[PDB]
Amino acid sequence: LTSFELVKVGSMKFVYKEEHPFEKRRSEGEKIRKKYPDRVPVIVEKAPKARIGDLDKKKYLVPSDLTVGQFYFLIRKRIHLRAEDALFFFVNNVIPPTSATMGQLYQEHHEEDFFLYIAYSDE
Amino acid sequence: LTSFELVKVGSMKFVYKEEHPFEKRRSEGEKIRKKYPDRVPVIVEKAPKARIGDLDKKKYLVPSDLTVGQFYFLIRKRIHLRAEDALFFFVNNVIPPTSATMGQLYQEHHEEDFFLYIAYSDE
Amino acid sequence: LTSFELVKVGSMKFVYKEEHPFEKRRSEGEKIRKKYPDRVPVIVEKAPKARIGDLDKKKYLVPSDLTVGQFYFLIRKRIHLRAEDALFFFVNNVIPPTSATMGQLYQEHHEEDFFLYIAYSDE
């Protein structure tokens, strides 16, 4: 292995889910989806061990046609990330395509409380 | 909604299409596609309300195998965008995948004047 | 063509393959894949004519679930690329999607010496 660079990169826990019982999360998610049917509610939290800054607001109401890439730029600005700093999103531990819409990701991956959960990391 | 960040992001009008009649655009597009069959002609214009700079040249003749991402970097340089500034492309209001080729996008979306139309924005 | 910007962008040769015979490369690749089945061995080299810097280490042992995009950021750091500088990866002359995993790319494109070959360029 001496001639190789060994690259080192599931333990995600959303504090929103730790702090608030499922039934209360679902009551909120259902109210939002009924009132704003063209938008999707998203919880965005930092992955453990990520040395990147913590995001100030975790709850977003996003137009369904907004892409991952457009949302990346919004989140980058909120964290005040420098251009040289990396940011990756994970939905159920998988990085989505940058051109996927938030509506598509919500339809495919929202949990039964009607939220889409996104983790972010710098690696 | 107080605990949510409400994210706010079809009205695109290409001045190339406003200024030049369809028949003249098509005559030009057909001549280009006949003379340069391995290239695609592309019109690139800024979306309304985008506070980003206006692009100096709007007409591009692009190798069919060039990707969206390679073209992004070219356009970023022409606008003199800083690395922290965002740039998104839209074809018929949809952001294409970064690894799609311009030839694929042309085949799927060129208009009957034989041009591919790309709008760009900072959001 | 006067009103058009003519955009100008297969000749790739991996020095790893020039310097080391196939049988020796394969012996190494097979040993690595047996010992580290959840990782993939990757050779990363600069494309000809690319004015970008040369990469210091060419051999990487990568987790199979790491994405192209995560690997991009690693390679960008090793080259000391500024944020305004472009970097593109090519596997058999094709830029892969940023959300593809290295395991997927390896399964689809590894050569019979059990290495995945990636070229990089600034255009």
Author numbering:
A (entry chain A), B (entry chain A), C (entry chain A): -13 to -5, -1 to 112
Manuscript excerpt for this entry:
Initiation of macroautophagy/autophagy is mediated by the ULK1 (unc-51 like autophagy activating kinase 1) protein kinase complex and the autophagy-specific class III phosphatidylinositol 3-kinase complex I (PtdIns3K-C1). The latter contains PIK3C3/VPS34, PIK3R4/VPS15, BECN1/Beclin 1 and ATG14 and phosphorylates phosphatidylinositol to generate phosphatidylinositol 3-phosphate (PtdIns3P). Here, we show that PIK3C3, BECN1 and ATG14 contain functional LIR motifs and interact with the Atg8-family proteins with a preference for GABARAP and GABARAPL1. Two hydrophobic pockets, HP1 and HP2, in the Ubl domain of Atg8 ensure binding of the side chains of the φ and η residues of the core LIR.
The peptide array for PIK3C3 indicated two potential LIR motifs; a minimal motif of 11 residues with the sequence LDRLTFREIEM (LIR-F198) and a second minimal motif of 5 residues with the sequence FELVK (LIR-F250). For PIK3C3, point mutations of both the aromatic residue and the conserved hydrophobic position (F250A, V253A) of the core LIR-F250 motif (FELV, amino acids 250–253) appeared to significantly reduce binding to the Atg8 homologs. In contrast, mutating the core LIR-F198 motif (FREI, amino acids 198–201) in a similar manner (F198A, V201A) did not affect binding of PIK3C3. This indicates that LIR-F250 of PIK3C3 is the functional LIR motif. If that did not work we made a chimeric protein consisting of GABARAP N-terminally fused to the LIR sequence with a Gly-Ser linker. We obtained high-resolution crystal structures of chimeric proteins consisting of GABARAP N-terminally fused to the LIR motifs of PIK3C3 and BECN1 with a Gly-Ser linker, and LIR peptides from BECN1 and ATG14 co-crystallized with GABARAPL1. The LIR-F250 of PIK3C3 (FELV) is a canonical F-type LIR motif with some stringent requirements for which substitutions were allowed in positions +2 and +3 and a requirement for D or E at position −1. The 2D peptide array of the PIK3C3 LIR showed that it is a canonical F-type (F at the aromatic HP1 position) LIR with some stringent requirements. In each of those 3 structures we observed some hydrophobic interactions between the residues C-terminal to the core LIR motif in position +4 to +6 (V255 [PIK3C3]-P256 [PIK3C3]; G101 [BECN1]-A103 [BECN1]; P439 [ATG14]-P441 [ATG14]) and HP2. The solved crystal structures indicated that the binding preference for the GABARAP subfamily can be explained by hydrophobic interactions between the residues C-terminal to the core LIR motif in position +4 to +6 and the hydrophobic pocket 2. Interestingly, the LIR motif of PIK3C3 is located at the start of the long linker region that is predicted to be crucial for enabling the HELCAT domain to reach its lipid substrates.
